[PDB]
Write a protein that binds this ligand. Sequence first.
Ligand SMILES: [Cl-]
Ligand code: NA
Length: 164
Amino acid sequence: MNIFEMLRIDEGLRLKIYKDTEGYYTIGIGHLLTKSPSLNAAKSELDKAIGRNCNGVITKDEAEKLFNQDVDAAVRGILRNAKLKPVYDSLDAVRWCALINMVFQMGETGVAGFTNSLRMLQQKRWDEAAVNLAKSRWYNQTPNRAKRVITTFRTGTWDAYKNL
Ligand SMILES: [Cl-]
Ligand code: NA
């Protein structure tokens, strides 16, 4: 499948503000609004993002617009970041989706911090990287999704997304 299809599986779709799997205010297809524990901070960011007074609720089309922007931002983040780009140069089409997925979920800075796992990926040590990634807080917080993403890195196939 493509990265959009993969992320729509992992993120689902919600039209009202919710808390993501990391505890942060979010909306639509995993659109992070703020890391601040402040609901008002989230609402103000939402209205800014959409361009109107949303009162914490958006439409489907607004959600998909944000989604496209967010996948774009994740791809661009991998390319700009000196710690992520070299990894990308070692990843095939399927494995790149796994990296984009991570950057979409945790952000460019967060993923760039996975120093050892990134090196293993860069060196095409797929099984080693898979074992290492499973030791992370990320895995412990969202094991189902992390397992899928890790299998994608490990195998370079879509096996983990085939029947969900
Ligand atoms: Cl390829
Ligand atoms: Na989500």
